[PDB]
Amino acid sequence: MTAFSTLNVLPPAQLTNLNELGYLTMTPVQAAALPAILAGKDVRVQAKTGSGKTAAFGLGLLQQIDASLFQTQALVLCPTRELADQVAGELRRLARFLPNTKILTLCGGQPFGMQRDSLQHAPHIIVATPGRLLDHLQKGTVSLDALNTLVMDEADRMLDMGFSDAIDDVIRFAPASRQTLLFSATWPEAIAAISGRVQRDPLAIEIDSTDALPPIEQQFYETSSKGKIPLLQRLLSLHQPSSCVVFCNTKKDCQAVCDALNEVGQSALSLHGDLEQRDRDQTLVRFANGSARVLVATDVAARGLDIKSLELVVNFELAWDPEVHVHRIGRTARAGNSGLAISFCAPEEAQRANIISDMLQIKLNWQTPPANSSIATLEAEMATLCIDGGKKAKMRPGDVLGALTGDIGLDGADIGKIAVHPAHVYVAVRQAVAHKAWKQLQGGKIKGKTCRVRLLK
Amino acid sequence: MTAFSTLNVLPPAQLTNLNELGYLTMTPVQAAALPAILAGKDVRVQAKTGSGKTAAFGLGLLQQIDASLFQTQALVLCPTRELADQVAGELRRLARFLPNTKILTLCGGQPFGMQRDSLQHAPHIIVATPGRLLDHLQKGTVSLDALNTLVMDEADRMLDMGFSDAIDDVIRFAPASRQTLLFSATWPEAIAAISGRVQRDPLAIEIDSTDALPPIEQQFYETSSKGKIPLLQRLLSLHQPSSCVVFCNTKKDCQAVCDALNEVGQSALSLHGDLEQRDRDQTLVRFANGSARVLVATDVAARGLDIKSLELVVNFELAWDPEVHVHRIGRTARAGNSGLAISFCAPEEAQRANIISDMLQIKLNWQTPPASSIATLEAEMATLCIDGGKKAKMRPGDVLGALTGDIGLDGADIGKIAVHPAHVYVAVRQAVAHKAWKQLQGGKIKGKTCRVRLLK
RNA sequence: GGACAUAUGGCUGUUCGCCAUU
RNA sequence: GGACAUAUGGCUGUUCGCCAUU
Numbered sequence: 001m002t003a004f005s006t007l008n009v010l011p012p013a014q015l016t017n018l019n020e021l022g023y024l025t026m027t028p029v030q031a032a033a034l035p036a037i038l039a040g041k042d043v044r045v046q047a048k049t050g051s052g053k054t055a056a057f058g059l060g061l062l063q064q065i066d067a068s069l070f071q072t073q074a075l076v077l078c079p080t081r082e083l084a085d086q087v088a089g090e091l092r093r094l095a096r097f098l099p100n101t102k103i104l105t106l107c108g109g110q111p112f113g114m115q116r117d118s119l120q121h122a123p124h125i126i127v128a129t130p131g132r133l134l135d136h137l138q139k140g141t142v143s144l145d146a147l148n149t150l151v152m153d154e155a156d157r158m159l160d161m162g163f164s165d166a167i168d169d170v171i172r173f174a175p176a177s178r179q180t181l182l183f184s185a186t187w188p189e190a191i192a193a194i195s196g197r198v199q200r201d202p203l204a205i206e207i208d209s210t211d212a213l214p215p216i217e218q219q220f221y222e223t224s225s226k227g228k229i230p231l232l233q234r235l236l237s238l239h240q241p242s243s244c245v246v247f248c249n250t251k252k253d254c255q256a257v258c259d260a261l262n263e264v265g266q267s268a269l270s271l272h273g274d275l276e277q278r279d280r281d282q283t284l285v286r287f288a289n290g291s292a293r294v295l296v297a298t299d300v301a302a303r304g305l306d307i308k309s310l311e312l313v314v315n316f317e318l319a320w321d322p323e324v325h326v327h328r329i330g331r332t333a334r335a336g337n338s339g340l341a342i343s344f345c346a347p348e349e350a351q352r353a354n355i356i357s358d359m360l361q362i363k364l365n366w367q368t369p370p371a372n373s374s375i376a377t378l379e380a381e382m383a384t385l386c387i388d389g390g391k392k393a394k395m396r397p398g399d400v401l402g403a404l405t406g407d408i409g410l411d412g413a414d415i416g417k418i419a420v421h422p423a424h425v426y427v428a429v430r431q432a433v434a435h436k437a438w439k440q441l442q443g444g445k446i447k448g449k450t451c452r453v454r455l456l457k
Numbered sequence: 458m459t460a461f462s463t464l465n466v467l468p469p470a471q472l473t474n475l476n477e478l479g480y481l482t483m484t485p486v487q488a489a490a491l492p493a494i495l496a497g498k499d500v501r502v503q504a505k506t507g508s509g510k511t512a513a514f515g516l517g518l519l520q521q522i523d524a525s526l527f528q529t530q531a532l533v534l535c536p537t538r539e540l541a542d543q544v545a546g547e548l549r550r551l552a553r554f555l556p557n558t559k560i561l562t563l564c565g566g567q568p569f570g571m572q573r574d575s576l577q578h579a580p581h582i583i584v585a586t587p588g589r590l591l592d593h594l595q596k597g598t599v600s601l602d603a604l605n606t607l608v609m610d611e612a613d614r615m616l617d618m619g620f621s622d623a624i625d626d627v628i629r630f631a632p633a634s635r636q637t638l639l640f641s642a643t644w645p646e647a648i649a650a651i652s653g654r655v656q657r658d659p660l661a662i663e664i665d666s667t668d669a670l671p672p673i674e675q676q677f678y679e680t681s682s683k684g685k686i687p688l689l690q691r692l693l694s695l696h697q698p699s700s701c702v703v704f705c706n707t708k709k710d711c712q713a714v715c716d717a718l719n720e721v722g723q724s725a726l727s728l729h730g731d732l733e734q735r736d737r738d739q740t741l742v743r744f745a746n747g748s749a750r751v752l753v754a755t756d757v758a759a760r761g762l763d764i765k766s767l768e769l770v771v772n773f774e775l776a777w778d779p780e781v782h783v784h785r786i787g788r789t790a791r792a793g794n795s796g797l798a799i800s801f802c803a804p805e806e807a808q809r810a811n812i813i814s815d816m817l818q819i820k821l822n823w824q825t826p827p828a829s830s831i832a833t834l835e836a837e838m839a840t841l842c843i844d845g846g847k848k849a850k851m852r853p854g855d856v857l858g859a860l861t862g863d864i865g866l867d868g869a870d871i872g873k874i875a876v877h878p879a880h881v882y883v884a885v886r887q888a889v890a891h892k893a894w895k896q897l898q899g900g901k902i903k904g905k906t907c908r909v910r911l912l913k
Numbered sequence: 914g915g916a917c918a919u920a921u922g923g924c925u926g927u928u929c930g931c932c933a934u935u
Numbered sequence: 936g937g938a939c940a941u942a943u944g945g946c947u948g949u950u951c952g953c954c955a956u957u
């Protein structure tokens with residue numbers, strides 16, 4: 001029985017949904033912010049990473065959704081496409097209590113035409129990045145006239161110098177009589193002081209100070225820039241993390257580190273803005289489901305990404321801003337878990353390490369370099385099958401699991417994460433059984449119908 | 458220089474284009490119909506199958522294309538989606554003489570929004586099936602206001618009872634002052650009499666009578682309906698055709714025969730209207746490049762499809778109309794080749810065999826069934842599907858360059874390369890297919906990384 | 914018969930389905 | 936720096952590019 005019932009607002013169908021979903025206890029940010037949000041107040045919330053802010057504003061805006069009114073009623077803004085799809089994915093699971101709730105994602109990298117076609121049936125909720133959404137607004141394919149709530153996730157990033165104009169351009173399409181929710185784990189005083197420009201009489205709910213991190217152990221290594229890649233390979237050999245995210249400050253360094261890790265057999269993929277959007281999506285799928293051991297990324301992955309039970313974060317180079325460092329290490333130690341965050345520091349980056357030390361009021365644990373120089377390989381335990389169809393073909397996870405376990409004859413313990421995307425379904429299978437599964441499912445049948453299956457790298 | 462120079466009309470760049478393409482001699486329909494078309498006249502043409510009608514109307518409409526004018530100036534209508542894409546494929550090859558010529562296909566099975574997106578830059582030429590084109594016309598995403606030429610390939614099918622309404626609906630968007638070209642190998646007089654409704658004082662160029670077939674040998678077998686599938690398996694085991702098209706009259710029989718052929722190990726794919734369009738496209742790709750030995754199809758493949766050096770056509774059931782029989786067997790013996798067409802005849806279908814006998818002025822060569830065991834038919838190739846296509850600026854040379862250079866493949870192990878709008882299909886011999894797929898998966902084409910799937 | 918065509922979404926992790934109207 | 940964004944096409948089967956204006 002869920003503790004969310006103590007709010008005395010949510011309908012019984014939502015309480016049953018939360019019980020089936022496993023939301024049995026409210027996190028602090030949920031307990032502190034949901035009553036005000038459900039009452040229609042504007043809020044600015046500050047809570048640490050991985051503490052459930054998504055459901056905090058998601059349960060809030062869902063309470064004011066009328067499924068019979070086929071117009072857009074809630075809008076969520078995110079700084080990155082992968083985060084936007086993730087937030088929309090969790091909103092959909094929270095919206096199960098309300099049948100026929102259409103939640104649409106509007107991001108770049110997708111062709112404009114398919115979004116225009118989907119927008120003829122106006123979605124109740126839009127989760128979007130500012131760029132593609134503004135395009136749709138200017139061409140009259142999206143209307144905000146029926147907007148009840150506007151949410152800005154990672155709101156200090158959405159209000160910075162880079163996003164302010166695009167955010168301002170979007171808000172002129174929004175009604176003034178709206179609930180505006182701003183959520184983030186970090187709030188620079190400059191950004192927080194001006195944050196009222198997009199709100200009406202907001203309540204400040206600052207339950208975690210900026211130095212109140214999740215349980216993250218931090219280690220720091222002195223190294224020249226030239227020694228970073230050899231050090232990283234040796235540290236990954238020492239810790240042997242089940243999953244690891246390595247952060248770089250440039251797209252060039254990001255791809256270079258990924259290629260260096262794959263050259264020594266340490267299963268790595270890259271995630272940055274010069275990749276094709278399909279590769280960005282498939283890389284995140286394969287890293288999350290265990291088809292890759294290490295993810296090398298720029299700050300496109302610094303915020304909000306919720307990779308389950310991430311063991312290790314490595315700062316190949318310290319971020320330009322200390323707030324970004326907080327978001328990076330926040331990729332681990334989520335939802336009550338602990339984590340380890342290693343940071344490399346060249347002499348030019350010493351001052352950024354000092355700024356992080358002051359802001360977080362932590363003592364840097366400088367480590368002595370490893371005793372062994374041996375570089376071991378890291379093989380990924382899973383491989384990803386990509387089946388054509390997705391939600392358009394009404395292929396649900398039970399169909400994939402049923403087909404894989406039946407005539408194709410696989411053990412249910414050999415199948416990991418199943419992710420249903422709009423046009424594809426991704427399945428994780430143990431590496432040893434992946435090739436047989438691919439060939440047998442290619443000439444088999446799923447849901448009575450024939451399928452097209454790909455085996456990803 | 459190519460004999461096309463004797464037309465004294467084509468620009469020099471097109472004469473060079475024809476020589477590089479291998480069009481060194483004009484076919485009869487090209488030699489007989491192109492002067493009138495290049496002079497701007499409406500024509501109704503009757504020429505046998507596989508004798509070059511596409512270039513006949515393709516060179517015609519391209520002569521009146523203004524590349525600086527970014528409006529639709531030529532429209533080609535086809536009865537099937539695969540034929541429309543095929544006709545556009547050869548039009549692009551013929552349009553190399555004119556840089557920056559946009560030829561777009563408008564067919565069903567493709568998402569509407571992506572087509573709307575492409576239509577912001579209006580294409581010079583549209584090749585389309587009537588259904589999806591009319592949708593675009595009614596929604597104002599396509600304009601025929603600047604149309605110079607209108608082509609109806611397989612014009613006798615486009616003017617029949619099933620298409621008449623939609624064709625009229627399309628023509629309502631076209632100018633009356635237009636060149637209208639009608640091509641087909643078959644012309645029922647009833648359809649030919651009403652064909653003038655869409656033309657302006659047309660020239661009739663009927664160089665092949667309906668019985669003037671390409672060199673196609675025909676054999677006929679008496680058989681029960683129950684004995685058809687075992688006979689087919691035995692005939693394919695005897696003949697071992699490198700490629701074969703088996704025609705059925707229903708979508709159910711089409712899939713049933715395909716599955717029975719695969720049960721005895723005779724590499725077969727199916728092509729019919731109940732398939733997803735992606736399956737239809739990939740089936741035609743894999744059959745055309747040798748990744749399957751037998752193609753089982755309904756009459757969706759009866760007309761216009763140009764499969765190179767197709768060895769055998771089998772009529773599992775005789776078509777309802779004799780003209781469709783002409784188009785079916787016309788899938789073989791193309792562009793000067795010979796071919797074999799076997800037909801099965803159940804007692805209920807004897808009447809259809811006689812009608813074919815009269816129309817084609819042939820005496821039926823009835824065969825006695827094979828003395829015979831059922832053998833396997835292995836596909837010699839496998840198809841790699843690379844993501845990108847023309848959207849990613851991938852030209853066939855890039856794929857071949859990556860396969861032969863870094864990945865280290867023999868150039869003689871790579872067959873047909875087909876650049877589609879979003880994908881590139883490559884045929885490689887099955888013995889090397891898995892190695893090619895895996896190494897191209899972790900390799901790079903054109904400097905950039907690729908994501909490669911193996912269809913099989 | 915065969916073509917042409919066939920909107921947009923919601924729904925249990927052992928499939929072959931069940932719903933909504935835009 | 937990193938996000939957001941990044942139109943539509945043409946180019947001769949041994950790639951890593953070259954062009955057009957919408």
Ligand SMILES: Nc1ncnc2c1ncn2[C@@H]1O[C@H](COP(=O)(O)OP(=O)(O)O)[C@@H](O)[C@H]1O
Binds near residue numbers: 051054
């Ligand atoms: N009340 C809850 N009970 C159990 N799990 C939760 C609860 N709220 C959130 N979670 C899960 O914990 C993780 C926290 O994710 P997220 O909301 O992205 O944190 P934040 O946005 O604050 O960084 C998510 O995987 C979410 O599904």
Ligand SMILES: Nc1ncnc2c1ncn2[C@@H]1O[C@H](COP(=O)(O)OP(=O)(O)O)[C@@H](O)[C@H]1O
Binds near residue numbers: 506507509512
């Ligand atoms: N003048 C020519 N010289 C050589 N080959 C040609 C010539 N014209 C056409 N071809 C080829 O011959 C085949 C005839 O195809 P197609 O035009 O579809 O015939 P039809 O439309 O008359 O059935 C095609 O593969 C085409 O590329």
Ligand code: BEF
Binds near residue numbers: 048050053303
């Ligand atoms: F702060 Be959470 F990681 F969005």
Ligand code: BEF
Binds near residue numbers: 508641
């Ligand atoms: F008449 Be051809 F086969 F198009």
Ligand SMILES: [Mg+2]
Binds near residue numbers: 053054153304
């Ligand atoms: Mg979040």
Ligand SMILES: [Mg+2]
Binds near residue numbers: 510511610761
């Ligand atoms: Mg033709």
